[model samples]
Target chain A: GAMGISLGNSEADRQLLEAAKAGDVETVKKLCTVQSVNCRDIEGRQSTPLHFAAGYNRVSVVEYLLQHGADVHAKDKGGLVPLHNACSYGHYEVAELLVKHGAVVNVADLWKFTPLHEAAAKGKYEICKLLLQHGADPTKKNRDGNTPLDLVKDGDTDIQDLLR
Target chain B: GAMGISLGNSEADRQLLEAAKAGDVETVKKLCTVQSVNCRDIEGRQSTPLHFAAGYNRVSVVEYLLQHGADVHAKDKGGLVPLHNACSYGHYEVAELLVKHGAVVNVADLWKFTPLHEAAAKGKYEICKLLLQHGADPTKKNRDGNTPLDLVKDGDTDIQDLLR
Candidate 1:
C-alpha cells in the first residue's frame, strides 16, 4: 500500500525517517514493519524513527516507533544523542518517553553542552530541573566557555535557583 | 636601520611602533626621521610612533614622537586613536602628551570601546579622569557588548563613582 519500489533497507529507512518527520502514519507503519529500515544517514547520524518522531513532536509516532524497537541511543552528527535533541527543543513528553526507554540522560554534544544547557537557554525550567534531578551535570561548560547556569539570564532566576 | 621591511606607510610606522613597544628610544628617533612612516596595518590599523610609544608607557619616547608630527587622529585596526591607547593603558603622562598634541580624547574602538572602558577595566582612576576631562565618552559599547561602566565590578566602585 506504500510506494512499491523495491528500495534497499537503508534507503527505505531514510525514507521512513522523512515520513516520520512529516507525520505520515501509513508510510511509518509500512517502513516500521521492514526490519532493516532503522538505518543511519551518510554522516553516521542515525535515522531512527524516534529521531524523526521526537524532532517533529509526533508523540504517537514516537510511542509506536519505540514499541517497535527503534534505537533510543542514536546520536547525530554533533554527538548529541536523542535525549539532547528532545531537551534542546523542549519536547518534554518525548524526552520523558525517551528517558523511560533508556536514552542516555546526560549525553553531551561536541562542545560538552548538556541537555540542561539547551533547556536553560530555552527557559524550560521543568525540563531543566528534570534533567538536573536525573543527574545531568549543571557545571558543564561548552567550547564557548559558558556553563548551563551561565545560559540562564535575569528572567530565568527561577531556573537558576533550581539549578543551584 | 630598521630590521623589518615596510608594507605600507602605516606598516613602516608599525615597525617604528614595535621599536617603541620594546622601549628602544634610538630606533624610535631613527624611524621618526623616515618620511611617510605613518602607515596603517593590512587590516587598516594605523600606527604613528606615538601610538606604540603611549601603549608601552614610554613617556619620553611618546614626547619625542608626538613632537615629530604623528597624526593624532590616526586610528588603529581596533578604531582606537592614540589617546585611547594611552588612557586605556594607564599612562597618564603619555595621555596628557597625546591630548596636548591634539589627539581626539573620545575616540572609540571597533566595538565603540572608549579609553574610559580600558581604564575602568584596568582600574586606573587618574587615567580615566584624564580621558573624561579631555572628552572621552564614558558610555560606549564594544563589539562584545560591554560598556566602560558595565566592566567595573567588585573593588572598582571608585571608578564607578568617578564615571557617575
Candidate 2:
C-alpha cells in the first residue's frame, strides 16, 4: 500500500490534490478552472490533482482532471505517472481511463519500474491482463535488469503467462 | 495497493471477511459469537476470522480471535496460518500478537513460504526486523532454496540490513 510517487514544483497549489483524494469533484473543478490543474504541493510528493485522483481511484475526478488539462504524461517527484499509482492500487478503471486519455502504459519511474512491474509485484492479475492487452512490455526490465516476470515469487511457476 | 497474500477457501463467508477488511469490529464480534469464529466456507480460500483480521491490520480483532479459540496455527485453504497472512499484508502488530501467542514464527505454507519470506518479498523492513528479533531464521530457505534475502527485489541495496 506504500507509494513512491510525489510530484512537486513551485507555483503549484496543492489543496486541490488533497481534495481530489477525497473525491471532491466540485472542489477540484473550481480549483483547476480558477487556477491551474497542475498546481503541485509545496511539501512532500507534490502530486498534481490528477495523480491524487488516479491513485485514489476517483474516476470522475480523474476524468475531470484530464479534461481540464491534467498532463497524462506528467511525472511525479519519483518520475512515476498516474498509471503507476492506479496499477499499484489495482484501480483498473482509473488505469484504463488514463490509457484511454493517452497515458503510456509502459513508462518507467525513477526506479525504471513500469506499471506492469507494479501490477505483477502486487499480483493484480486483472490489471496485469489489462496492461498486457494494452501492450505493456513484460520483457522490459527495470534498472536492475529484472523483467516483470522475474519479480514473481519463488514456488510460483505460473509466470508462464508473463513469459508470453 | 492490492496485497498478494491469499487465504481464501471455497467455503469461506466473504461477507464476514469483507467486514474484517473494513475494520468493523462490532460486526465481526456479532458474527463470531452467534455463528463460529472458525466457521470457514466450503468454496475458495479458507481464511479464518483471525487470518482476515491479521491481514487487514485489525489488532483488536486479532486479539479477540486468539482469545476466543481462533487457532493461530490454523491453516487456510492456501496452507497459510494467521501469521503468514499478517506478514503478507505487512501487519506488524497482528504478526506480533500471533507470535506472542506461540504461533510458529517461521512456519511455511504448502508453497514453502515462511512469514519471513513474505515480509522480505513485500519489502516490509519493519516486519522482517520483528521476525528476526524473535528467532525467525533468516538463513532458512524455501522449497526453491531461496532465502528471505534472495527474495529482495532487484536494485534494493538497502536490503543490506535484511541480509545479515
Identify the leading candidate in terms of lDDT. Answer: 2
Quote model 1's TM-score.
Answer: 0.45
On residues B40-89, what C-alpha lDDT tens digit does candidate 2 reach at each position? Answer: 43233445577778878899988877886666765554457778888878
Which regions of candidate 1 fall more than 4 Å away from where they truly are? A1-10, A43-46, B1-164
Query: A1-164 in candidate 2: lDDT tens per residue?
Result: 11113213322245676778899988777767423565444354545678889888999999988887676765554556789899988899999899888878877765678999888887777788888888999899887888888876654566546546
As a whole number from 0 to 100, the lDDT of residue B91 in candidate 2 is 86
Docking class of 2: incorrect
lDDT by residue (B1-164, candidate 1, tens digit) is: 00122223233445676787788888877766523234333322334456677778898887777677556665444456677777666788888887787766555544566677878887888888887787766777765777788887676678888887
State the iRMSD of every prediction, in order shown: 30.1, 23.2
| Tens-digit per-residue lDDT, A1-85, candidate 1 | 0012211223565678788888898888887752333344432233356777887788888888888766665444344556766
Off by over 4 Å in 2: A1-12, A157-159, B1-164
TM-score of chain A of 1: 0.84
Question: In candidate 2, residue A17 scores what lDDT?
Answer: 69
